[PDB]
Amino acid sequence: SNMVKIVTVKTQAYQDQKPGTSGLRKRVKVFQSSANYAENFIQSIISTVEPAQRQEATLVVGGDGRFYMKEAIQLIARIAAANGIGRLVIGQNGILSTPAVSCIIRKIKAIGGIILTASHNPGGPNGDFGIKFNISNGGPAPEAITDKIFQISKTIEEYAVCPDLKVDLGVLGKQQFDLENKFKPFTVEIVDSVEAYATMLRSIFDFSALKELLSGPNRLKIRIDAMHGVVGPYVKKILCEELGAPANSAVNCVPLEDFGGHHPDPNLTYAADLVETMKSGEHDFGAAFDGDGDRNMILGKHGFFVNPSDSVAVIAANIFSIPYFQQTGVRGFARSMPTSGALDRVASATKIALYETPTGWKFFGNLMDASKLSLCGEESFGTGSDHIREKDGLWAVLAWLSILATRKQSVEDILKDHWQKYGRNFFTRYDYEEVEAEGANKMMKDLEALMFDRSFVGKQFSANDKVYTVEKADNFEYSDPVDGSISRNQGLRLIFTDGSRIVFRLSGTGSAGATILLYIDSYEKDVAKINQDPQVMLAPLISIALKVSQLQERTGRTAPTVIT
Ligand SMILES: [Mg+2]
């Protein structure tokens, strides 16, 4: 059980093993009930690595703890070994947060990693499973590589595997495996799930300033909800053990294979337990993370909700409370196109570049690799820095703690001050789920044709009292300044002279039929307007959005599925 044979298994190809930008995500049953399904996909990844580079290569491997993950890691090891891959670094018990994997790939200069996560999607025997491939910069495999893996998956006929190799995932250290009639060994190193990521955070943030903030009778009282996913141990070992926060601060911080039977997806409904806890008024700061730790929700005293578009703006405005940025400086700011323009106000005032990208990581990564991007955020609960090449939920929480420690204000008072200084970008996202594809497609084509007409710029819409004048309308296009690529049809933008925007996108998910995403960003600068209810302040533009798009007529929906 340390000396294993290499064998070749004939297999039948599948046709649907397309890695996408976030990994191949299938129902767990599919993986269990489809012969060699996982085997085929893992082999197809490894086949992208030139056989001459495998011995010297290391792959980082870990996941979010969901059901089926360890069985997948075992067969990843069995296949990487047979294929001549030299070394695997695997998090203890298979557990590695997505930011941790990106951390470790970059630190040890691995060729890439394979993350066993489906992020926010439910886990368990009746849930989903995902296999994500990252490359040597720590970030997601780009299109040209995922295309290759797809190609190989569709015509694969055999894979190589040591069926007898079994890694003990529970014990730290190097396990060596001697392969029959192979000179070099195959080496697995089990590493503590948290250490290398904690060591990175210890250099990024002022752990002494934070321990002071979090400890003692005058402590900042926090509740940090890992939603039964991967970031749990990271919370316990960093916020509690190392930074001295009371152990009751770590909520749902024990990874569960079914994530507790719920979606590890941070927002005001999936994380309603945190919200109600914060509602009591006992704690100053709340936060929630998704299954793999790259998304985060930020809550203040009494459940005050910092929406992700605002969060990245507040961090930008106070970025030098964070030692990493004092020493790198601020290379640039970025948000996805549908994210609110609050960040732009900070970037304009402090005169730092604001990159407005299509949705998707690759655009942030390219700018990061160019040394042009320090801080990025997305309206979908995503905040990141160029410290790694994934977004990082716990990083965003420690950024907020750093800012709370230097500001010595509540979360809410910080936001009120932010809104008084930069004005407020009220923001909401409307989700229309599983509308008929023909109707949604017609809605988009009709709206775009309407926007394209020479008279549309300048058109006026009463609210009333307020008049919105369209300054610009288009289907968003982005020419990437690094890889040369052009991304078209990235979303319909109605840009108004007052700084406000309406944005329509069709969701790229594989759900039954289309999902419509309507983003409303209404800028207000006035004192009597910036502390009103957001949904009340957004209602005029919501009315304009639905009228100009004829959404109800094209879909039959009188209300969104979700309001965020
Ligand atoms: Mg995620």
Coordinates of C-alpha atoms and ligand atoms in Angstrom, one line a residue:
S1 CA 0.0 0.0 0.0
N2 CA 3.0 2.2 -0.8
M3 CA 4.1 0.2 -3.9
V4 CA 1.5 0.5 -6.7
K5 CA 1.0 -0.6 -10.3
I6 CA 0.3 1.7 -13.2
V7 CA -2.7 0.4 -15.3
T8 CA -4.5 1.6 -18.4
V9 CA -8.3 1.7 -18.3
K10 CA -10.3 1.8 -21.5
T11 CA -13.1 4.4 -21.3
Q12 CA -16.0 5.7 -23.3
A13 CA -15.9 9.5 -23.8
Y14 CA -18.6 11.9 -22.7
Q15 CA -19.7 14.9 -24.7
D16 CA -20.7 17.4 -21.9
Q17 CA -17.5 17.8 -19.9
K18 CA -17.0 21.5 -20.7
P19 CA -14.9 23.2 -18.0
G20 CA -16.3 26.8 -18.4
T21 CA -14.8 29.6 -16.4
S22 CA -15.7 28.2 -13.0
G23 CA -15.2 24.5 -13.5
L24 CA -17.2 21.5 -14.7
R25 CA -20.3 21.5 -12.5
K26 CA -22.6 18.4 -12.6
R27 CA -25.0 16.8 -10.2
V28 CA -23.3 14.5 -7.7
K29 CA -25.4 11.6 -9.0
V30 CA -24.0 12.2 -12.5
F31 CA -20.5 11.7 -11.2
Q32 CA -21.5 8.6 -9.3
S33 CA -23.7 7.0 -11.9
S34 CA -21.6 7.7 -15.1
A35 CA -18.8 5.3 -15.4
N36 CA -15.4 6.9 -15.5
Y37 CA -17.0 10.4 -15.6
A38 CA -14.6 11.9 -13.1
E39 CA -11.7 9.7 -14.3
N40 CA -12.1 10.9 -17.9
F41 CA -12.2 14.6 -16.9
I42 CA -9.2 14.5 -14.6
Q43 CA -7.2 12.6 -17.3
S44 CA -8.1 15.3 -19.8
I45 CA -6.8 18.0 -17.6
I46 CA -3.5 16.2 -17.0
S47 CA -3.1 15.5 -20.7
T48 CA -2.8 19.2 -21.2
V49 CA 0.5 19.1 -19.4
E50 CA 3.4 18.1 -21.7
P51 CA 4.7 14.7 -20.5
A52 CA 8.3 16.1 -20.3
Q53 CA 7.2 18.6 -17.6
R54 CA 5.1 16.3 -15.4
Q55 CA 7.9 14.9 -13.2
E56 CA 9.1 18.4 -12.1
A57 CA 5.4 19.6 -11.8
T58 CA 3.3 20.0 -8.6
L59 CA -0.5 20.3 -8.7
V60 CA -2.3 21.8 -5.7
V61 CA -5.4 19.9 -4.8
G62 CA -8.2 20.7 -2.4
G63 CA -11.9 21.6 -2.1
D64 CA -14.8 23.0 -0.1
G65 CA -15.6 19.8 1.8
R66 CA -18.8 19.0 0.0
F67 CA -19.9 15.4 -0.5
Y68 CA -17.9 13.3 -2.9
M69 CA -14.8 15.5 -2.7
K70 CA -12.4 13.1 -1.0
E71 CA -13.3 10.3 -3.4
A72 CA -12.5 12.7 -6.2
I73 CA -9.2 13.7 -4.6
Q74 CA -8.2 10.1 -4.2
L75 CA -8.8 9.4 -7.9
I76 CA -7.1 12.7 -8.8
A77 CA -4.0 11.3 -7.0
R78 CA -4.4 7.8 -8.6
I79 CA -4.4 9.5 -12.1
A80 CA -1.8 12.1 -11.5
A81 CA 0.5 9.4 -10.2
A82 CA 0.0 7.1 -13.2
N83 CA 0.5 10.0 -15.6
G84 CA 4.0 11.0 -14.3
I85 CA 2.9 14.1 -12.4
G86 CA 5.7 14.5 -9.9
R87 CA 4.0 15.9 -6.8
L88 CA 0.7 16.8 -5.3
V89 CA 0.2 19.3 -2.5
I90 CA -3.2 18.5 -0.9
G91 CA -4.9 20.3 2.0
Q92 CA -5.5 18.3 5.1
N93 CA -8.6 16.2 4.8
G94 CA -8.7 17.5 1.2
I95 CA -9.8 20.9 2.5
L96 CA -8.5 24.0 0.7
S97 CA -10.4 27.3 0.2
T98 CA -10.3 28.6 -3.3
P99 CA -8.2 31.6 -2.2
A100 CA -5.9 29.1 -0.3
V101 CA -5.3 27.1 -3.5
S102 CA -4.5 30.3 -5.4
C103 CA -2.2 31.3 -2.5
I104 CA -0.3 27.9 -2.6
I105 CA 0.0 27.7 -6.4
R106 CA 1.7 31.0 -6.4
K107 CA 3.9 30.5 -3.3
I108 CA 5.3 27.1 -4.3
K109 CA 5.3 27.8 -8.0
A110 CA 3.0 24.9 -8.9
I111 CA 1.9 24.5 -12.5
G112 CA -1.7 24.8 -11.4
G113 CA -4.3 23.3 -9.1
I114 CA -7.6 21.3 -9.2
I115 CA -10.3 22.6 -6.8
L116 CA -13.1 20.3 -5.8
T117 CA -15.8 22.9 -5.4
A118 CA -19.1 24.1 -6.9
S119 CA -18.8 27.4 -5.0
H120 CA -22.2 28.6 -3.8
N121 CA -24.1 25.6 -5.2
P122 CA -25.7 23.1 -2.7
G123 CA -23.7 20.0 -1.6
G124 CA -24.6 16.5 -0.5
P125 CA -25.7 13.2 -2.0
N126 CA -28.5 15.0 -3.8
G127 CA -26.4 18.1 -4.6
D128 CA -23.9 19.4 -7.1
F129 CA -20.2 18.7 -7.6
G130 CA -17.6 20.7 -9.3
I131 CA -14.0 20.2 -10.6
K132 CA -12.2 23.5 -11.3
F133 CA -8.8 23.8 -13.0
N134 CA -6.4 26.6 -12.1
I135 CA -3.1 27.3 -13.9
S136 CA 0.4 28.5 -12.8
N137 CA -0.5 32.1 -11.9
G138 CA -3.0 30.8 -9.3
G139 CA -6.0 31.8 -11.4
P140 CA -8.7 30.0 -13.4
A141 CA -7.6 28.2 -16.5
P142 CA -8.4 30.5 -19.4
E143 CA -10.5 29.7 -22.4
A144 CA -7.7 28.4 -24.6
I145 CA -6.9 25.7 -22.0
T146 CA -10.5 24.8 -21.0
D147 CA -11.2 24.5 -24.8
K148 CA -8.3 22.0 -25.0
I149 CA -9.6 19.9 -22.1
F150 CA -13.0 19.8 -23.6
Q151 CA -11.6 18.7 -26.9
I152 CA -9.7 15.9 -25.2
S153 CA -12.7 14.9 -23.1
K154 CA -14.9 14.4 -26.1
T155 CA -12.7 11.7 -27.8
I156 CA -10.8 10.2 -24.9
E157 CA -10.5 6.4 -25.1
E158 CA -8.2 5.5 -22.2
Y159 CA -6.8 6.9 -19.1
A160 CA -3.9 5.9 -16.8
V161 CA -4.4 5.2 -13.1
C162 CA -2.8 3.4 -10.2
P163 CA -6.0 1.8 -8.8
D164 CA -4.2 0.7 -5.5
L165 CA -2.7 4.1 -4.5
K166 CA -4.5 5.5 -1.5
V167 CA -3.5 8.8 0.1
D168 CA -4.1 9.3 3.8
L169 CA -5.6 12.8 3.7
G170 CA -5.8 13.2 7.5
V171 CA -2.1 13.2 8.4
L172 CA 0.4 16.0 7.7
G173 CA 3.7 15.3 5.9
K174 CA 5.1 13.7 2.8
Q175 CA 3.7 10.4 1.6
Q176 CA 5.8 8.7 -1.1
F177 CA 4.5 6.3 -3.6
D178 CA 6.8 4.0 -5.6
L179 CA 5.3 3.1 -9.0
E180 CA 6.0 -0.3 -10.5
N181 CA 8.8 0.0 -13.2
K182 CA 9.0 3.8 -12.7
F183 CA 12.3 5.3 -11.5
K184 CA 11.1 8.5 -9.9
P185 CA 8.6 8.4 -7.1
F186 CA 5.2 10.2 -6.8
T187 CA 5.1 12.5 -3.8
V188 CA 2.0 13.8 -1.9
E189 CA 2.5 16.4 0.7
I190 CA -0.5 16.9 3.0
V191 CA -0.4 20.5 4.3
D192 CA -2.4 22.2 7.0
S193 CA -5.4 23.7 5.3
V194 CA -5.0 27.2 6.7
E195 CA -1.2 27.8 7.4
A196 CA 0.0 29.1 4.1
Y197 CA -3.1 31.3 3.6
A198 CA -2.8 32.6 7.2
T199 CA 0.9 33.3 6.7
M200 CA -0.1 35.3 3.6
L201 CA -2.8 37.2 5.5
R202 CA -0.3 37.8 8.4
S203 CA 1.9 39.7 5.9
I204 CA -1.0 41.5 4.2
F205 CA -2.7 42.8 7.4
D206 CA -1.6 44.1 10.8
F207 CA -2.5 41.1 12.9
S208 CA -1.3 43.1 16.0
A209 CA -3.7 46.0 15.3
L210 CA -6.4 43.4 14.7
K211 CA -5.8 41.4 17.8
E212 CA -6.1 44.6 19.8
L213 CA -9.3 45.4 18.0
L214 CA -10.9 42.0 18.5
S215 CA -9.8 41.3 22.2
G216 CA -10.6 42.6 25.6
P217 CA -13.7 44.2 27.1
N218 CA -13.6 47.1 24.6
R219 CA -13.5 44.5 21.8
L220 CA -15.2 44.9 18.4
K221 CA -17.9 42.2 18.6
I222 CA -18.1 40.2 15.3
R223 CA -20.1 37.2 14.0
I224 CA -18.5 35.5 11.0
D225 CA -20.7 32.9 9.3
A226 CA -18.8 30.4 7.1
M227 CA -22.2 28.8 6.1
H228 CA -20.8 25.4 6.9
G229 CA -18.3 25.6 4.1
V230 CA -14.6 25.8 3.5
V231 CA -13.7 29.0 5.3
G232 CA -14.8 27.7 8.7
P233 CA -11.4 26.4 9.9
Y234 CA -9.8 29.6 8.4
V235 CA -12.1 31.6 10.6
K236 CA -11.4 29.6 13.7
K237 CA -7.6 29.5 13.2
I238 CA -7.2 33.1 12.2
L239 CA -9.9 35.2 13.7
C240 CA -10.3 33.2 16.9
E241 CA -7.1 31.3 17.8
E242 CA -4.6 33.7 16.3
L243 CA -6.4 37.1 16.6
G244 CA -8.1 36.3 19.9
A245 CA -11.7 36.8 18.9
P246 CA -14.1 34.8 21.2
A247 CA -14.8 31.4 19.9
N248 CA -18.5 32.3 19.6
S249 CA -17.5 34.6 16.7
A250 CA -17.1 31.6 14.4
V251 CA -20.6 30.8 13.1
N252 CA -21.1 27.6 11.2
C253 CA -17.4 27.2 11.0
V254 CA -17.3 23.4 10.8
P255 CA -17.2 22.2 7.2
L256 CA -20.2 19.9 6.4
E257 CA -20.5 17.7 3.3
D258 CA -24.0 19.0 2.7
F259 CA -23.2 22.5 4.0
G260 CA -25.9 22.0 6.6
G261 CA -28.5 21.2 3.9
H262 CA -28.5 24.8 2.6
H263 CA -26.8 26.8 -0.1
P264 CA -23.4 28.2 1.0
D265 CA -24.4 31.4 -0.7
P266 CA -24.0 34.7 1.2
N267 CA -26.9 37.1 0.9
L268 CA -29.7 38.4 3.1
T269 CA -31.9 35.3 2.6
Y270 CA -29.6 32.4 2.4
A271 CA -27.7 33.8 5.3
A272 CA -30.8 35.0 7.2
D273 CA -29.5 33.4 10.4
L274 CA -26.5 35.7 10.5
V275 CA -28.9 38.6 9.6
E276 CA -31.2 37.9 12.5
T277 CA -28.2 37.5 14.8
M278 CA -26.9 40.9 13.7
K279 CA -30.5 42.2 14.1
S280 CA -30.2 41.9 17.9
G281 CA -27.8 44.8 18.1
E282 CA -25.2 43.0 20.2
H283 CA -22.4 42.8 17.6
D284 CA -20.7 45.5 15.6
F285 CA -19.8 43.4 12.5
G286 CA -21.2 40.4 10.7
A287 CA -20.1 38.6 7.6
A288 CA -20.8 35.5 5.5
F289 CA -18.9 33.4 3.0
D290 CA -19.8 31.1 0.1
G291 CA -18.9 27.4 -0.2
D292 CA -15.3 28.0 -1.4
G293 CA -14.5 31.3 0.3
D294 CA -14.2 33.6 -2.6
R295 CA -17.4 35.6 -2.0
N296 CA -18.4 37.6 1.1
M297 CA -21.3 39.5 2.6
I298 CA -20.7 42.4 5.0
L299 CA -23.2 43.3 7.7
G300 CA -23.1 46.1 10.3
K301 CA -24.7 46.7 13.7
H302 CA -28.4 45.9 13.7
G303 CA -28.1 44.0 10.4
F304 CA -27.1 47.1 8.4
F305 CA -26.3 45.7 4.9
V306 CA -23.2 46.9 3.1
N307 CA -24.0 46.0 -0.5
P308 CA -21.0 44.6 -2.4
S309 CA -20.8 47.6 -4.8
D310 CA -20.5 49.9 -1.8
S311 CA -18.1 47.6 0.1
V312 CA -15.4 47.7 -2.6
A313 CA -15.8 51.5 -2.7
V314 CA -15.4 51.9 1.1
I315 CA -12.3 49.7 1.1
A316 CA -10.8 51.7 -1.8
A317 CA -11.5 54.9 0.1
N318 CA -9.7 53.6 3.2
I319 CA -7.3 51.3 1.4
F320 CA -4.2 52.5 3.3
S321 CA -5.5 51.2 6.6
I322 CA -4.1 47.9 5.0
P323 CA -0.3 47.5 5.2
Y324 CA -0.1 45.6 1.9
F325 CA -1.3 48.6 0.1
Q326 CA 0.9 51.1 2.0
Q327 CA 3.8 49.1 0.6
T328 CA 2.6 48.1 -2.9
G329 CA 0.6 51.3 -3.3
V330 CA -2.6 51.4 -5.4
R331 CA -2.0 50.2 -8.9
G332 CA -5.6 50.6 -10.0
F333 CA -9.3 49.9 -9.3
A334 CA -11.7 47.7 -11.2
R335 CA -15.3 46.6 -11.1
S336 CA -17.5 44.5 -13.4
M337 CA -19.6 46.6 -15.7
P338 CA -23.0 45.9 -13.9
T339 CA -21.5 46.7 -10.5
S340 CA -22.5 50.1 -9.1
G341 CA -20.4 53.2 -9.8
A342 CA -19.6 53.9 -6.1
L343 CA -16.0 52.7 -6.7
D344 CA -15.7 55.2 -9.6
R345 CA -16.4 58.1 -7.3
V346 CA -13.5 57.1 -5.1
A347 CA -11.3 56.4 -8.1
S348 CA -12.2 59.7 -9.7
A349 CA -11.5 61.7 -6.5
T350 CA -8.3 60.0 -5.5
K351 CA -7.4 59.9 -9.3
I352 CA -6.7 56.2 -9.7
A353 CA -7.6 54.2 -12.8
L354 CA -11.0 52.7 -12.9
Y355 CA -11.2 49.6 -15.2
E356 CA -14.8 48.6 -16.0
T357 CA -14.7 45.0 -17.2
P358 CA -17.2 42.4 -18.4
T359 CA -18.3 39.9 -15.9
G360 CA -15.6 37.2 -15.4
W361 CA -12.3 36.8 -13.6
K362 CA -10.0 36.8 -16.7
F363 CA -10.4 40.5 -17.1
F364 CA -9.3 41.2 -13.5
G365 CA -6.4 38.7 -13.7
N366 CA -5.0 40.2 -16.9
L367 CA -4.9 43.7 -15.4
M368 CA -3.4 42.2 -12.2
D369 CA -0.6 40.5 -14.1
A370 CA 0.1 43.8 -15.8
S371 CA 0.6 45.5 -12.4
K372 CA -2.4 47.7 -13.2
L373 CA -5.0 46.4 -10.7
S374 CA -4.8 46.5 -6.9
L375 CA -8.5 46.2 -5.7
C376 CA -11.5 44.8 -7.5
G377 CA -15.1 44.2 -6.6
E378 CA -18.3 42.8 -8.2
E379 CA -21.9 43.4 -7.3
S380 CA -22.2 39.6 -6.8
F381 CA -20.6 39.6 -3.3
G382 CA -17.0 39.5 -4.7
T383 CA -14.1 41.6 -3.5
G384 CA -10.4 40.9 -4.3
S385 CA -6.9 42.2 -4.5
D386 CA -3.9 41.4 -6.6
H387 CA -2.5 39.4 -3.5
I388 CA -3.7 36.3 -5.4
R389 CA -5.6 35.4 -8.6
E390 CA -8.9 34.5 -7.0
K391 CA -11.4 36.7 -5.1
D392 CA -11.1 36.2 -1.4
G393 CA -14.0 36.6 1.1
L394 CA -12.0 36.3 4.3
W395 CA -9.5 38.8 2.9
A396 CA -12.3 41.2 2.4
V397 CA -13.4 40.7 6.1
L398 CA -9.9 41.4 7.4
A399 CA -9.8 44.5 5.1
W400 CA -13.0 45.7 6.8
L401 CA -11.6 45.0 10.2
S402 CA -8.4 47.0 9.4
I403 CA -10.6 49.9 8.4
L404 CA -12.8 49.6 11.4
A405 CA -9.7 49.7 13.6
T406 CA -8.3 52.8 12.1
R407 CA -11.7 54.6 11.6
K408 CA -13.1 53.8 15.1
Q409 CA -16.6 54.2 13.7
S410 CA -19.5 51.7 13.3
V411 CA -20.0 50.1 9.9
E412 CA -23.1 52.2 9.4
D413 CA -21.4 55.5 10.3
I414 CA -18.6 54.7 8.0
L415 CA -21.1 54.3 5.1
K416 CA -23.0 57.4 6.0
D417 CA -19.7 59.4 5.9
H418 CA -18.8 57.7 2.6
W419 CA -22.2 58.7 1.1
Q420 CA -21.9 62.3 2.3
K421 CA -18.4 62.5 0.8
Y422 CA -18.8 60.7 -2.6
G423 CA -22.6 60.7 -2.9
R424 CA -24.6 57.5 -2.9
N425 CA -25.0 54.9 -5.6
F426 CA -28.2 53.3 -4.7
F427 CA -28.1 49.8 -6.2
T428 CA -30.2 46.8 -6.7
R429 CA -30.2 43.8 -8.9
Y430 CA -33.4 42.2 -10.2
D431 CA -33.3 38.5 -11.2
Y432 CA -35.9 37.0 -13.5
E433 CA -35.3 33.3 -13.3
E434 CA -36.2 30.7 -16.0
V435 CA -38.2 33.0 -18.3
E436 CA -38.9 31.7 -21.7
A437 CA -35.8 32.0 -23.9
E438 CA -37.7 33.3 -27.0
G439 CA -39.3 36.1 -25.0
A440 CA -36.1 37.2 -23.2
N441 CA -34.1 37.1 -26.4
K442 CA -36.7 39.3 -28.1
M443 CA -36.7 41.7 -25.2
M444 CA -33.0 42.1 -25.5
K445 CA -32.9 42.5 -29.3
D446 CA -35.8 44.9 -29.3
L447 CA -34.3 47.0 -26.5
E448 CA -30.9 47.1 -28.2
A449 CA -32.4 48.2 -31.6
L450 CA -34.3 50.9 -29.7
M451 CA -31.1 52.1 -28.0
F452 CA -29.2 52.1 -31.2
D453 CA -31.4 54.6 -33.0
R454 CA -29.8 58.1 -33.4
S455 CA -32.6 59.8 -31.4
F456 CA -32.3 57.6 -28.3
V457 CA -29.4 59.6 -26.8
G458 CA -31.0 62.7 -25.3
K459 CA -34.4 61.1 -24.7
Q460 CA -35.9 62.1 -21.4
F461 CA -37.9 60.2 -18.8
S462 CA -39.9 61.8 -16.0
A463 CA -40.0 60.2 -12.6
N464 CA -41.4 62.7 -11.8
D465 CA -40.0 65.7 -10.1
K466 CA -36.7 64.3 -11.4
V467 CA -35.9 64.0 -15.1
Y468 CA -33.4 61.4 -16.3
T469 CA -31.7 62.2 -19.6
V470 CA -29.9 59.4 -21.4
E471 CA -26.3 60.3 -22.1
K472 CA -25.3 57.0 -23.7
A473 CA -26.8 53.6 -24.6
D474 CA -25.1 50.6 -26.0
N475 CA -24.3 46.9 -25.8
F476 CA -21.2 46.9 -23.7
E477 CA -18.0 45.9 -25.5
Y478 CA -14.5 45.6 -23.9
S479 CA -11.2 45.4 -25.7
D480 CA -8.9 43.9 -23.2
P481 CA -5.6 45.9 -23.0
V482 CA -3.5 42.8 -22.3
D483 CA -4.5 39.7 -24.3
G484 CA -6.0 41.8 -27.2
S485 CA -9.3 40.1 -27.0
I486 CA -12.6 41.8 -27.7
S487 CA -15.7 40.8 -25.7
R488 CA -19.0 41.9 -27.3
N489 CA -22.7 41.8 -26.3
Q490 CA -21.7 42.1 -22.6
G491 CA -24.9 43.9 -21.6
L492 CA -27.2 46.7 -22.5
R493 CA -26.4 49.9 -20.7
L494 CA -28.7 53.0 -20.3
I495 CA -26.4 55.7 -19.0
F496 CA -28.0 58.9 -17.6
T497 CA -26.5 62.4 -17.4
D498 CA -27.0 62.4 -13.6
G499 CA -24.6 59.4 -13.1
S500 CA -27.3 56.8 -12.9
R501 CA -27.5 53.7 -15.0
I502 CA -29.8 50.8 -16.0
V503 CA -28.2 47.6 -17.2
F504 CA -29.7 44.5 -18.7
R505 CA -27.8 41.2 -19.0
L506 CA -28.9 37.7 -19.8
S507 CA -27.4 35.2 -17.3
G508 CA -25.0 32.7 -18.8
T509 CA -26.2 29.9 -16.6
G510 CA -27.3 26.5 -17.9
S511 CA -30.6 26.7 -16.1
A512 CA -33.8 25.8 -17.9
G513 CA -34.3 28.8 -20.2
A514 CA -33.0 32.3 -19.8
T515 CA -32.5 34.3 -16.6
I516 CA -32.7 38.1 -16.9
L517 CA -30.5 40.3 -14.8
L518 CA -31.6 43.9 -14.3
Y519 CA -29.2 46.2 -12.5
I520 CA -30.3 49.6 -11.2
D521 CA -27.7 52.2 -10.2
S522 CA -29.2 55.5 -9.1
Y523 CA -26.7 58.2 -8.1
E524 CA -27.8 60.8 -5.5
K525 CA -25.6 63.6 -4.0
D526 CA -28.3 65.4 -1.9
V527 CA -28.3 65.2 1.9
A528 CA -32.1 64.6 2.1
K529 CA -31.9 61.8 -0.5
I530 CA -28.8 59.7 0.5
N531 CA -30.3 58.2 3.7
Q532 CA -33.7 57.1 2.3
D533 CA -34.8 53.6 1.7
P534 CA -33.0 52.2 -1.4
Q535 CA -36.0 50.5 -2.9
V536 CA -37.9 53.8 -2.7
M537 CA -35.1 55.7 -4.3
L538 CA -34.6 53.1 -7.0
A539 CA -38.3 53.0 -7.9
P540 CA -38.3 55.7 -10.6
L541 CA -35.5 54.0 -12.5
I542 CA -37.0 50.6 -12.0
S543 CA -40.2 51.9 -13.6
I544 CA -38.2 53.4 -16.5
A545 CA -36.3 50.1 -16.9
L546 CA -39.4 48.0 -17.1
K547 CA -41.2 50.4 -19.5
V548 CA -38.4 50.9 -22.0
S549 CA -37.7 47.1 -22.1
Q550 CA -41.3 46.0 -22.1
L551 CA -40.1 43.2 -19.9
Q552 CA -43.5 42.3 -18.5
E553 CA -44.9 42.2 -22.0
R554 CA -42.0 40.0 -23.3
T555 CA -41.9 37.6 -20.4
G556 CA -45.2 37.6 -18.4
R557 CA -43.3 38.6 -15.3
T558 CA -44.8 41.2 -13.0
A559 CA -42.0 40.8 -10.4
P560 CA -38.4 39.6 -10.3
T561 CA -37.7 36.3 -8.7
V562 CA -35.0 37.8 -6.5
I563 CA -34.2 41.3 -5.4
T564 CA -30.7 41.8 -4.2
Ligands
MG1 MG -17.2 30.9 -4.9

